[PDB]
From a paper:
To obtain crystals of the [name]-bound protein, Cys20-mutated [name] (C20S) was used, which lacks reductase activity but exhibits [name] binding activity. The [name]-bound [name] structure was refined at 1.7 Å resolution and contained one molecule of [name] bound to [name] in the asymmetric unit. The [name] bound to a pocket at the cleft that separated the N- and C-domains of [name]. In detail, the 3′-OH and 6′-OH groups on [name] formed hydrogen bonds with the side chain of the Lys8 and Lys210 residues, respectively. In addition, the 5′-OH group of [name] interacted with the OD2 atom of Asp19. The C1′-carbon of the bound [name] was 5.0 Å from Ser20, but rotation of the side chain may produce a suitable distance for catalytic reduction by the Cys20 residue. Structural analyses also revealed that [name] undergoes [name]-associated conformational changes. In particular, the Lys8, Trp207, and Lys210 residues showed structural differences from their corresponding residues compared with the oxidized and GSH-bound structures, and rearrangement of these residues is related to the movements necessary for the interactions involved in [name] binding. In contrast, the bound [name] in [name] is surrounded by α1, α5, and α7, forming the H-site20. The bound [name] in [name] interacts with Lys8 and Lys210 via hydrogen bonds and forms van der Waals interactions with Pro21, Phe104, and Trp207.
DHAR catalyses the reduction of DHA to [name] using glutathione (GSH) as a hydrogen donor before the spontaneous hydrolysis of DHA to irreversibly form 2,3-diketogulonic acid. To expand our knowledge of the underlying molecular mechanism of [name] activity against ROS, high-resolution crystal structures of the apo-form, [name]-bound, and GSH-bound [name] were examined at 1.9, 1.7, and 1.7 Å resolution, respectively. The structure shows that the asymmetric unit contains one molecule of [name] and adopted a canonical GST fold, consisting of three β-strands and three α-helices in the N-terminal subdomain (residues 4–84) and six α-helices in the C-terminal subdomain (residues 94–210), although [name] showed modest sequence identity (~20%) with GSTs. Structural comparison studies revealed that Cys20 is a catalytic residue and that Lys8 directly interacts with [name] and GSH to reduce Cys20.
Numbering used by the authors: 2 to 212
C-alpha cells in the first residue's frame, strides 16, 4: 500500500493543508488512480514517528511500499510515473520548464510592501509567457491531455490566485484568456477538488509571511 505524508492545514491537524508540493504528489496519485493512505503532518508540531522517518522534517515524503520514505516532489512524481505508467503523465522535455518562474515571482510580489518595485511586472511577464505557450500549445501544457507539468503548476497557480486576490486584491488580467481557461479547467478537476486546501487555510498559511 502506497503512503504519503503531507502538510496539514495550519491550526487544524486533522485537515488537509496547502503545500503545493504535497498537492502535486496527491494529484499524481489521484489522476493515476493509485490507492494510497494519506498521513497528515502538523508541520509546526511534527510527530516523533515522522521525524524518525523524515529526520530533516521534509514534507511530502512518499512510501511506494518498498520500505523507504522518499522526499522531493520532483523525484516522487517520477517514481510514481515509473511504477504506474498508465495513464502516462510524461511531459515532453521541451515543455518541462513552462511556468517554472511563476511561483517564485508570485511569492515575491505577495510579500512585497513596495507597490513599485517591479515585483508585479515580473509576475505578469511570466504569466504572459504562460499565456503565449497555451495560446500555441493549449489547452494543457502538452496540448491535450494532462501531464506532470500540469500537476506541478496547478497547485502553484491556485496559491497565486487565492493569495494575491485576498492579500492584495490583485487578479490575473482577463486579457490572459488561455491562462484563465487553464486554471478553470485544472481547478475544477475531480482530483484537484479532492486534494486542494480550503481557501481559508491557504490564507492562514500565508498570513504570517505577509506580516
Ligand atoms: O510554498 C508553500 O505554500 C504553503 C503556504 O502555507 C506558505 O507557507 C506552504 O506550506 C508551502 O511550502
Amino acid at each position: 500500500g502506497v503512503e504519503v505524508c503531507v502538510k496539514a492545514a495550519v491550526g487544524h491537524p486533522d485537515t488537509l493543508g496547502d503545500s503545493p508540493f504535497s498537492q502535486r504528489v496527491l494529484l499524481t496519485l489521484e489522476e493515476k488512480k493509485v490507492p494510497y493512505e494519506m498521513k497528515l503532518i502538523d508541520v509546526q508540531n511534527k510527530p516523533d514517528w515522522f521525524l524518525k522517518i523524515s529526520p530533516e522534517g521534509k514534507v511530502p515524503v512518499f512510501n511506494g511500499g518498498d520500505g523507504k520514505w522518499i522526499p522531493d516532489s520532483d523525484v516522487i512524481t517520477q517514481v510514481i510515473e515509473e511504477k504506474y505508467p498508465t495513464p502516462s503523465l510524461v511531459t515532453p522535455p521541451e515543455y518541462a520548464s513552462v511556468g517554472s518562474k511563476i511561483f517564485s515571482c508570485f511569492t515575491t510580489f505577495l510579500k512585497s510592501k513596495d507597490p513599485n518595485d517591479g515585483s508585479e511586472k515580473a509576475l505578469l511577464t511570466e504569466l504572459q509567457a504562460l499565456e503565449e505557450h497555451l495560446k500555441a500549445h493549449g489547452p494543457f501544457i502538452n496540448g491535450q491531455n494532462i501531464s506532470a507539468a500540469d500537476l506541478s503548476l496547478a497547485p502553484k497557480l491556485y496559491h497565486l490566485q487565492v493569495a494575491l486576490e485576498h492579500f492584495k486584491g490583485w487578479k490575473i488580467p482577463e486579457d490572459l484568456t488561455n491562462v484563465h481557461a487553464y486554471t478553470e479547467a485544472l481547478f475544477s478537476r475531480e482530483s484537484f477538488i479532492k486534494t486542494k486546501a480550503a481557501k481559508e487555510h491557504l490564507i492562514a498559511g500565508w498570513a504570517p509571511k505577509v506580516n
